[PDB]
Every structure is written in C-alpha cells, then in structure tokens.
Design a protein around this ligand. Structure first.
Ligand SMILES: Nc1ncnc2c1ncn2[C@@H]1O[C@H](COP(=O)(O)O)[C@@H](OP(=O)(O)O)[C@H]1O
Length: 275
C-alpha cells in the first residue's frame, strides 16, 4: 500500500525512539520527557497510518494510541472527554497523519517532539513513511540483548512464543539498522540498553549531543514529577531507579533452543556475547 507523498515535506525537526519491544524504550522515553527542550509523550502510534480514519479503522476499540489523547491533554490543558473529542473530530475529517505531526510540533512550541515506538520497526514499510513525511527526522535505535528481550517478551504473554519473540527482535533490529544505513550518522544513533542502564549520564549525554540539546539532570530521574506515566511498559512503575541489574538478565537465562543463524549475526553487529 503506497504512502501519499505530501505536497511539501515537513522541514521541522522530529525524532523517533525505535526498538524491538521489551528493550527499555519506556525508560528511555520517560528519561527524555524530563528534559525541558524535548517533548516525549507516551506512544502516539501515528506513523503506520495514512489518515486518522485508517488509524481509527485499524485501532478501533484498542487502548494502543491513547498516548495521543494524553499528549493533547498535557500540551493543551484538556480533560479526557475534550481530548477524545479532538481525536474523534480528526477521525471524522480523515485528517492526514502528516497534519497530526505538524500539529503536535506546533503545540510542542520550541520543544523537539519524540515519537517512541516499539512496533514501527516491525515493518520496513511503516519506517519508510517517516522519510516520505519529513526532511530532518532523527532516529534513536535502542538495542537490547536478544536473550533479555526473548525472556521478557515470553513472561509478558505478548504472543512457539520463543521463536516469535526472537523473530520480532530480529525483524525490528534489522529494519531499523537498514533505515539507519539509508540516512546519515547525522540522523541515526544506536543506543545499547546495557550501556544506558550502567552509565545513564554518559549515554544520555551522547543522545543529547545527537538531538542538539544540552544535558539536563532531570534525564536521570525518570521516577520524579509528571512524565505522563499515569501504553508502554506495564511494569514501569514497579522500579525505584535506573536499575543496572536488569541489564544482566540475559546472563541467568537459557532459552529452550539455540538462536537462528541470522539472529546471531545481527546480535554480533551490536557486539553482544551469545553462550
Ligand atoms: N527503571 C528501569 N531501569 C532499568 N530497566 C528498566 C526500567 N524500567 C523498565 N526497564 C526495562 O525495560 C523493559 C521494557 O522495555 P519496553 O519499555 O521497551 O517494553 C523492562 O522489561 P521487564 O519488566 O520484562 O524486565 C525492563 O527490563
């Protein structure tokens, strides 16, 4: 299904946090929400759709995409009912997704809008929509150890569930890597979850340099103030700090069978060790 090419591409900066699910993407986006020069809301889920009509047809009842309501409430001092009504009106008007991004960029004012998604990378065609819509999109590719993702995906009953979890990690990571190769290092940055949790100050400083903002201490305190956490990780609020022990989860795990040959090659590209 071909993407509608806008009359004029969006020249305004935007950034995405792309990863496989269960990779610390909620932690990273919540860390980023503390920065005063960035706007990092819960999952907008806009990129896979052409218009708000397609989005409504595909999503429907599902709670996925409710982050757009939360964003609007926060950006405009709206109630849930008033937020939903703004969404319902866009739906009725079959409002192009290109317009929703330009709207949020406007409502974010000077702040750099960050669209975090653990599912956009599952389909190369979804990722292709960004290069069609934007001139200056930046991509943060957050990567986690395949064993840690598989174990976590298994536990959460997100679904052989082990083969599907491996497939999703591999598919996403390969698609995001391929996107990164097409755009410059100027518009793509790999972030290793294991490095983020062991030294968040060093990693978040690199992310800030990439996004063109200064480092702010609030980045290190995801559990303080309103960061719009009230989808994403359902267990997120079960932690007190940036937990470095969660990185070493891949060490106490033995999967029912060996990883596939291309899953191994891809994991080696990110310097991971596989026993
Ligand atoms: N405060 C924190 N510190 C370190 N890691 C965290 C964290 N909060 C969540 N995570 C990691 O992020 C994972 C979820 O990633 P995503 O947000 O992309 O779904 C969690 O999976 P588990 O709760 O299964 O361990 C957890 O390992």
């Amino acid at each position: 299904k071909q993407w509608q090419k806008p009359d004029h591409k969006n020249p305004n900066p935007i950034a995405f946090i792309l990863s496989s699910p269960r990779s610390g993407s909620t932690l990273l986006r919540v860390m980023l929400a503390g920065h005063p020069g960035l706007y990092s809301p819960p999952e907008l889920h806009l990129l896979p759709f052409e218009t708000m009509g397609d989005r409504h047809q595909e999503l429907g009842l599902s709670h996925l995409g409710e982050g757009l309501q939360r964003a609007l409430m926060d950006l405009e001092n709206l109630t849930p009912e008033a937020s939903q009504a703004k969404v319902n009106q866009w739906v009725k008007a079959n409002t192009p997704i290109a317009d929703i991004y330009a709207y949020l960029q406007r409502q974010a004012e000077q702040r750099l809008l960050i669209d975090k998604s653990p599912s956009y990378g599952s389909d190369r065609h979804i990722l292709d929509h960004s290069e069609i819509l934007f001139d200056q999109a930046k991509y943060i590719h957050l990567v986690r150890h395949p064993y840690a993702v598989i174990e976590s995906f298994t536990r959460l009953r997100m679904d052989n569930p082990y083969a599907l979890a491996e497939s999703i990690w591999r598919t996403s990571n390969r698609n995001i890597l391929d996107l990164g190769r097409t755009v410059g290092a100027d518009r793509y940055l790999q972030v290793i979850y294991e490095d983020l949790v062991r030294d968040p100050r060093k990693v978040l400083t690199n992310i800030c340099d990439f996004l063109g903002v200064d480092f702010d201490e609030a980045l290190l305190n995801p559990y303080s103030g309103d960061r719009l956490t009230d989808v994403g990780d359902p267990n997120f609020l079960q932690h007190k700090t940036i937990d470095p022990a969660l990185a070493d989860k891949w060490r106490s795990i033995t999967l029912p069978a060996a990883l596939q040959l291309d899953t191994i090659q891809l994991a080696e590209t990110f310097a991971y060790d596989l026993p």
